[PDB]
């Protein structure tokens, strides 16, 4: 499970075992996190720029 | 002497002409500079910014740590006296 | 020799002057006048303090005056008379001007300009006092002369903006007297310094001025602040005019310092957190703005407590203002790890400073956000936990007692467990996954508004300076 | 060079007085022979400043403390004298050189040489301001790039043998500089080596890792501590950034660690530590936690920093990978896995929740543990919404700022 | 000051009125009006009367109700003119505890209702829920059901389109921006 290799949780509060195939993450919001990323670097840039005029 | 990121309001604002008598109106509204008052006033000088080691100047980054103290001779202490109890179990 | 000197530092004024005196005989405007008349009181602040106490006496006595001359003099006698430079030829002139306060007019009288004229003295003597940093008689003297001359006749617009400086230099050194020594009738004149200060609002709400509204807004919170009349200052911050048009980012810094005293007084911790913040981004970094900062920085502090939220050990760090900010690092330490034992030792210790602040009234009530922050880290730890834990671990008495402090602590919503008793434990209600939830919905709509309001500003701004400059010839 | 590094650790173990007995002791020994033979007399009285009234100080020259635990740290005025007598015969035979050097022809080649000389005396003998002042002249006259990376990680070696971090990081800086501009592959591996040890030093143990790992691969004896504490340093540095698939992978992707074998008291703890972590029977891994304290923080120059660090970090690390697996745990058998007891588990892990950086849950009336990380879309929000906030905050101030001007 | 406007009544005047704000539950006045009195006597005439007040607020903001009836009890012992506020603010720790329990509980048995409201007498206890509205069957209260009516009632007023906020109404925000 460490290998996240099939999936899956082992339960110790009872003793059994959960297999999941199930969907997990979401390309498009994984990518969102990029973007946010991209618009803090141009701004570190602009305000040197901006710091000509103060 | 810089209020938060001290780069980030170095460059968001610098001298003018025009505005450096307001300034100075500010820091006398509050009457003082209010970090040579605090010696004084104390009677002392600084003993308690040497609490701990990123405290006293930053040349270091961030812990996470507020008391510092060593965590290894209590990690020691548990780890022997379980070791016991399992012996003599 | 010593003539040159009064004779320099006279001409460097003159040409301040005479600038805005031409801008003004166009047509008055607020804005352009006042980056002069700025640039100027920078160099009568620096000359006056460094260069003789009697270089403004030269100039009070070339101008024809009222009869503010003599009592210029006045305060100069005490700390050692100058009669220096007052023969003719520092009063046989007024002072290069092309005809409109020249000398051979003036004296002729066939114009007398005096309007402009009389509210640059008064800046002058303003100025000196604080230079000198004497207060005594000389403050009084200052009050009692210009406020009635400036009373008995409307002002123009330009001679407003001139008399909004004026009083807050008048409001400052009677607030530093009773700091020095307390007095008994420093107290009743300051019912008389009140009644001034609001009935100025009204006079400058028929000139139409914005810069001089605003300015006046700044000294009526201060001045309820210090005089501890709260309950006033939260009639009046409910009804406000502020404009942020044509203000200076100094008055601006210190209009939002001013809501987060009143609002933290008022228990409301989050309006407060938000100005506070404001006030900041707008100071400089510099050692101009240094106690502006501190006293903001106590107040930035003392909200985050207040509320649960605990600064950054970084901020202080990162900062060169550790030992001001001394108290409130061991204030941040002790609630964090819920140690009421080691709160009730910072505030014994440092008990002095914090009320010389007055910020001791605020301090006092982390007495209970140690309690409360204290469950909401037990209530983190552990899903479900017996109320004898609890006791031992934030010293507290019987069970039956946690047991109330978190019914109250749940309807502010700041433990967001409840109680079980006749199951025996404390079961919060967090479990994350609110993605699964509509509330994610909610919160992206509020940053796109955010978004569009900026948006705004940068429209109406990015023209308006541009618009002033293609119309002028500079062609 | 070669053996300034090797005293300046030994003088950090007298400096502290927390190292075993024998090992000061062996350390007070090695550092007074290399005083006759060095003259490492005048670094002698630089550790007496890191003391006054605090322990590992017996000093004669100074003020000698009997409450202290080291005895051994004798500043002798036999030391003293053989101080002044190697210090006035050394300047004086080599001026007499460096001046007929000078006056004969060629400024690229000799006046070069003869100058660096001059630093080369000074810096092995602990006094940098002199090394500074005449290996500037060095720099100044035309000479390869490769000869000025070379002082240059000569003056960095002073600030290391000082142990000051400050005057190393300046240094250090400048020669970041210049090998981009020398294009010398030689002396590129000699900057990855001082580089990672100054990381090391930092907090900056993502970029720390990625260099001692290189390290291996290419090592330098030059300048530079032993090839043994080069691989302690790695693994060290390995397990506090990465987790189990990335750690694995790291040290079955070195073959160069591997062949190093333990044979150190302070390798075998670390690399015994690494086994158990991405191994997942954490049973070994808390009695070893404390030998890795014991062994490598504490002796290190630049570990006695982090000493206390590296111990909070971990013992979040090793129980977050269990918690992951495991959508419930018994507080007993995790008890049992790590190999200690119930409550001192409970207390640990009370350190860790609220900041709310581990995200777990504990019934004490069932006993189990509850994890509430989110393992779905929720977590990659809990990233998104805090960068979003701090956008908005940095485009607010800097538009508002830029109007109003 | 210093010169007849500072007097023993005057520090028994302004302990009394300490009081009346805060019977009349407006601690947004009570803190505001301790700032005036900052300026004033605390210090110079040292809390011997006025400490009574100040501590109460204080207990009930970290949330302990046993130290704030106790202080009220012991304030009860002394009938003078201070007990007449003390009532006022007994019957106060009532509703506050009122407002908490419906997210606190969903079950409290009848003796159990008794011990949070500081009553002595479970009749007393049966008196108040009429009043203050809680339905007690079988002797055991339900939380649920007066939760509910509340909300109901936050619902019924014009607020209400954005309060929400409608999937619609959202975008529709959005679109005119653009084209503005």
């Known amino acids: 499970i460490l290998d996240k290799i099939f999936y899956g949780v082992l339960d110790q509060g009872n003793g059994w075992l959960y297999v999941y195939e199930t969907p997990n993450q979401d390309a498009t919001y994984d990518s969102a996190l990029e973007l946010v990323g991209q618009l803090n670097k141009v701004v570190d840039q602009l305000f040197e720029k901006a710091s000509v005029l103060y | 002497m810089s209020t938060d990121v001290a780069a980030a309001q170095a460059q968001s604002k610098i001298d003018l002409t025009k505005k450096k008598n307001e300034e100075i109106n500010k820091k006398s509204l509050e009457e003082d500079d209010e970090f040579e008052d605090f010696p004084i006033d104390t009677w002392a000088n600084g003993e308690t910014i040497k609490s701990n080691a990123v405290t006293q100047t930053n040349i270091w980054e961030e812990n996470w740590d507020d008391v510092e103290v060593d965590d290894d001779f209590t990690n020691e202490l548990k780890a022997e006296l379980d070791r016991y109890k399992r012996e003599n179990q | 020799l010593h003539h040159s000197e009064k004779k320099y530092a006279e001409e460097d004024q003159v040409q301040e002057l005479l600038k805005v005196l031409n801008e003004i005989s166009k047509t008055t405007l607020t804005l352009d006048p006042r980056y002069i008349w700025r640039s100027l009181k920078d160099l009568s602040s620096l000359r006056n303090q460094e260069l003789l106490n009697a270089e403004t006496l030269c100039f009070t006595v070339n101008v024809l005056y009222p009869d503010s001359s003599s009592f210029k003099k006045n305060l100069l006698k005490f700390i050692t008379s100058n009669h220096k430079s007052s023969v003719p030829g520092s009063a046989e002139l007024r002072n290069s001007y092309p005809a409109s306060f020249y000398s051979v007019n003036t004296e002729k009288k066939t114009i007398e300009v005096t309007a402009e004229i009389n509210c640059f003295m008064h800046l002058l003597v303003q100025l000196f006092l604080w230079d000198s940093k004497e207060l005594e008689q000389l403050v009084e003297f200052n009050r009692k002369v210009v406020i009635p001359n400036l009373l008995c006749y409307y002002n123009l617009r330009s001679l407003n903006l001139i008399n909004a400086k004026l009083w807050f230099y008048i409001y400052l050194s009677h607030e530093t007297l009773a700091r020095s020594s307390e007095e008994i009738n420093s107290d009743n004149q300051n019912i008389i310094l009140r009644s001034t200060m609001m009935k100025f609002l009204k006079i400058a709400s028929l000139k139409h001025d914005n810069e001089t509204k605003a300015m006046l807004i700044n000294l009526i919170l201060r001045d309820f602040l ?132 007055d910020t001791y009234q605020l301090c006092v009530r982390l007495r209970s956000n140690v309690i409360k922050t204290g469950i909401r880290i037990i209530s983190l730890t552990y899903k479900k936990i017996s109320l004898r834990d609890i006791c031992l671990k934030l010293n507290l008495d019987s069970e039956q007692t946690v047991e109330y402090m978190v019914s109250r602590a749940i309807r502010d919503g700041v433990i967001e467990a409840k109680i079980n008793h006749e199951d025996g434990f404390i079961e919060t209600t967090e479990l994350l996954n609110i993605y699964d939830s509509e509330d994610p919905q909610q919160v992206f709509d509020e940053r796109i508004k955010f978004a569009n309001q900026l948006h705004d500003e940068y429209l109406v701004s990015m023209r308006y300076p541009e618009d002033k400059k293609t119309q002028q010839n500079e062609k | 060079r070669v053996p300034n590094y090797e005293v ?199 970029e720390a890792a990625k260099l001692l790992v290189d390290s291996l691969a290419t090592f330098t004896s030059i300048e530079l501590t032993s090839y043994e504490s080069i691989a302690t340093y790695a693994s060290v540095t390995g397990l506090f950034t990465l987790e189990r698939t990335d750690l694995k992978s790291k040290v079955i992707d070195s073959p160069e660690l591997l062949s190093l074998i333990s044979t150190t008291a302070a390798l075998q703890s670390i690399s015994s530590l690494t086994i158990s972590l991405y191994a997942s029977d954490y049973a070994s891994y808390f009695p070893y936690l404390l030998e890795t304290y014991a062994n490598v923080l504490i002796p290190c120059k630049y570990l006695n920093r982090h000493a206390d660090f590296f111990v909070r970090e971990m013992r979040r690390k090793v129980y977050a990978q269990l918690l992951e697996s495991y959508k419930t745990l018994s507080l007993k058998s995790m008890a049992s896995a790590f190999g200690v007891s119930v409550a001192f588990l409970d207390n640990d892990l009370g350190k860790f929740i609220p900041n709310k950086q581990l995200n777990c849950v504990i019934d004490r009336v069932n006993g189990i543990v509850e994890t509430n990380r989110p393992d779905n879309k929720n977590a990659q929000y809990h990233l998104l919404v805090k960068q979003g906030d701090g956008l908005l905050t940095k485009l607010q101030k800097y538009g508002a700022a830029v109007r109003l001007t | 000051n210093h010169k007849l406007s500072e007097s023993d009544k005057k520090s028994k005047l302004i302990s009394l009125y300490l009081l009346n704000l805060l019977s009349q539950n407006n601690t947004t006045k009570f803190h505001s009006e301790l700032q005036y009195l900052d300026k004033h006597i605390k210090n110079l005439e040292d809390d011997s009367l006025l400490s009574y007040p100040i501590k109460l607020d204080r207990w009930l903001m970290e949330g302990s109700y046993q130290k704030a009836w106790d202080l009220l009890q012991s304030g009860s012992q002394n009938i003078s003119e201070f007990d007449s506020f ?51 069957v079988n002797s055991k209260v339900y939380f649920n059901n007066q939760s509910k009516e509340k909300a109901d009632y936050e619902d019924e007023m014009m607020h209400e389109e954005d309060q929400k906020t409608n999937i619609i109404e959202k975008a529709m925000d959005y679109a005119i921006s653009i084209e503005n």
């Open chain 3, 226 to 357: 210090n005089n501890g009349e709260v309950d006033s200052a939260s009639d009046f911050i409910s009804k406000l005019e502020y404009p942020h048009t044509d203000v200076s980012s100094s008055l601006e810094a210190r209009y939002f310092f001013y809501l987060s005293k009143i609002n933290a007084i008022q228990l409301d911790y989050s309006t407060a957190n938000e100005y506070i913040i404001a006030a900041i981004r707008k100071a400089p970094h510099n050692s101009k703005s240094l106690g502006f900062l501190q006293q903001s920085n106590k107040l930035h502090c003392c909200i985050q407590l207040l509320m649960g939220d605990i600064p950054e050990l970084s901020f202080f760090h990162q900062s060169n203002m550790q030992k001001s900010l001394l108290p409130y690092y061991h204030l941040t330490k002790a609630v964090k790890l819920g140690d009421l034992k080691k709160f009730t030792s910072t505030i014994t210790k440092y008990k002095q400073l914090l009320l010389k602040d």
């Open chain 4, 8 to 206: 300046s650790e030994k003088a950090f173990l007298l400096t502290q007085s927390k190292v075993s007995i024998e090992q000061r002791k062996e350390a007070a020994e090695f550092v007074l022979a290399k005083i006759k033979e060095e003259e490492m007399a005048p670094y002698y009285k630089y550790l007496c400043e890191e003391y006054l009234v605090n322990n590992g100080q017996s000093d004669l020259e100074h003020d000698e403390k009997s409450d202290s635990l080291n005895e051994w740290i004798k500043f002798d005025q036999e030391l003293y004298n053989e101080l002044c007598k190697k210090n006035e015969s050394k300047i004086k035979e080599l001026n007499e050189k460096i001046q007929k050097l000078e006056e004969d022809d060629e400024g690229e080649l000799e006046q070069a040489q003869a100058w660096i000389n001059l630093g080369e005396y000074y810096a092995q003998i602990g006094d940098k301001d002199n090394a500074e002042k005449t290996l500037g002249k060095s720099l100044s006259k035309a000479i390869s790039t490769g000869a000025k990376i070379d002082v240059m990680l000569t003056i960095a070696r002073l600030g290391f043998f000082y142990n000051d971090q400050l005057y190393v990081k300046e240094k250090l800086e400048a020669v970041n500089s210049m090998i981009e501009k020398g294009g010398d592959w030689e002396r590129r591996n000699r900057y990855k080596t001082y580089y990672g040890i100054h990381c090391l030093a930092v907090r900056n143990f993502k």
């Open chain 5, 86 to 136: 003390t009532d006022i603010l007994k019957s106060a720790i009532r509703d506050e505890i009122a407002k908490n329990t419906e997210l606190s509980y969903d079950f409290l048995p009848l003796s159990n209702i008794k011990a949070l409201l500081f009553f002595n007498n479970e009749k007393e206890t049966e008196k108040f829920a009429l009043e203050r509205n809680w339905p007690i």
